[PDB]
Amino acid sequence: PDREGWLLKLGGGRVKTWKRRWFILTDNCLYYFEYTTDKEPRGIIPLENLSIREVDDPRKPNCFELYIPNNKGQLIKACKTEADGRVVEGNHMVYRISAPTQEEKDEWIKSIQAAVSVD
Ligand SMILES: O=P(O)(O)O[C@@H]1[C@H](O)[C@H](O)[C@@H](OP(=O)(O)O)[C@H](OP(=O)(O)O)[C@H]1O
């Protein structure tokens, strides 16, 4: 992988809460898993056509967002796995993510910008 680590992700549904997932950036794609050894990703977020921005959040530190610029209301193309094994579409307009430190946030941002620009 180009980068891996624990990050908190905000949900995309009615009651949006933060969950800690193991994220792996590789192949112009951002994956996340429940455990570091899980063979299959719980979520797949292709980075094509996505941009990244810093954001401030009232509850969690060190945040950034993946989003579609000038978005006319479209969801980000992604997959997500439910409890029963079902592969479904992601429900997100944005992915808001929180890193443990400012240094980790900066390093994830540089890594993600390097992936999308050249692919
Ligand atoms: O129980 P709810 O209220 O429907 O909330 C969902 C629940 O927290 C899932 O665990 C989470 O998926 P992951 O385990 O894959 O992180 C999902 O994130 P999502 O909106 O990004 O799919 C939430 O929407």
Side-chain angles (χ1 to χ4, degrees), residues 9-15 17 19 21 32 42-43 80-81 90-92 95:
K9 167 192 56 82
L10 186 60
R14 176 56 186 89
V15 189
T17 70
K19 298 286 187 100
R21 303 281 174 253
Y32 73 82
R42 192 167 273 181
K80 183 264 183 58
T81 304
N91 61 3
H92 282 255
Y95 292 83

Side-chain angles (χ1 to χ4, degrees), residues 14-111:
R14 176 56 186 89
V15 189
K16 298 180 171 67
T17 70
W18 297 91
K19 298 286 187 100
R20 178 176 171 271
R21 303 281 174 253
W22 179 250
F23 278 77
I24 304 178
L25 170 69
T26 191
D27 212 347
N28 300 320
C29 277
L30 187 62
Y31 296 92
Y32 73 82
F33 304 73
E34 203 197 342
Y35 299 114
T36 73
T37 43
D38 276 352
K39 303 197 138 154
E40 302 311 317
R42 192 167 273 181
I44 302 165
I45 309 160
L47 296 173
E48 300 180 0
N49 306 309
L50 299 192
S51 297
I52 190 157
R53 57 180 171 206
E54 284 175 322
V55 299
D56 299 305
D57 190 89
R59 300 190 180 180
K60 300 292 177 173
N62 314 301
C63 296
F64 60 89
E65 271 173 7
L66 307 176
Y67 73 109
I68 296 171
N70 319 315
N71 197 8
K72 300 190 180 180
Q74 300 180 0
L75 304 170
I76 289 165
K77 300 190 180 180
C79 306
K80 183 264 183 58
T81 304
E82 300 272 34
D84 300 340
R86 309 138 41 214
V87 175
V88 299
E89 291 184 339
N91 61 3
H92 282 255
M93 287 260 296
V94 302
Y95 292 83
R96 192 173 277 220
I97 302 180
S98 169
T101 65
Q102 194 166 101
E103 300 180 0
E104 277 290 305
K105 182 201 75 185
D106 289 346
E107 291 266 48
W108 272 101
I109 287 168
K110 300 190 180 180
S111 295

